[PDB]
Amino acid sequence: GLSDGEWQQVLNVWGKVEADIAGHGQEVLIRLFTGHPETLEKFDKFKHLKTEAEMKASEDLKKHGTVVLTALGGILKKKGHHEAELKPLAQSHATKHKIPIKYLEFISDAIIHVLHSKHPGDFGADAQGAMTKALELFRNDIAAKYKELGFQ
């Protein structure tokens, strides 16, 4: 679990994602696809995207960015009483989308990167440790549901 102070830090930082949810979400997805181009094949509608400028110019990619970060926002605000939120998310990602836990680790990393990049020296040692622990918990709780289901 995180501590109370650790959640407060997580949620304060998520305060800044919510000022520009679309632009954060899009930078997240662009970090992901360019560092890990196999993740791009999971999206039928994004594999016409050969360049960054193409990625950067896509409103549909930004739309997905928002869907992603909005649902993570909800999850985070439940502070690890997040089972009702998280369980059907895990099921769709295992059975339908077929997203390996490794791609989830890649997007966690992309979110840490994007918080540092968009908030240079405003996202400190302490806040970065708590967000990492919060994303680890997210990932741990999905991994458990994945194991149940035999996914990988």
> Which positions lie near ligand MNH, rule CB under 6 A?
39, 42-43, 45, 67-68, 71-72, 89, 92-93, 97, 99, 103-104, 107
The residue (of 5 and 50) whose beta carbon lies closer to ligand MNH is 50
d(CA 48, CA 107): 21
Q: How far is the CB of 107 from ligand MNH (least distance, A)?
A: 4
Residue 91 CB, nearest approach to ligand MNH (Å): 8
In the block, residue with structure tokens 């077929």 = 98
State which residue, 88 or 124, has the beta carbon closest to ligand MNH: 88
Annotated binding site for nitrite: 64
> CA–CA separation, 39 vs 12, rounded Å?
29
How many angstroms separate the CA atoms of 123 and 44, rounded?
Answer: 34
CB closer to ligand MNH out of 5 and 71: 71
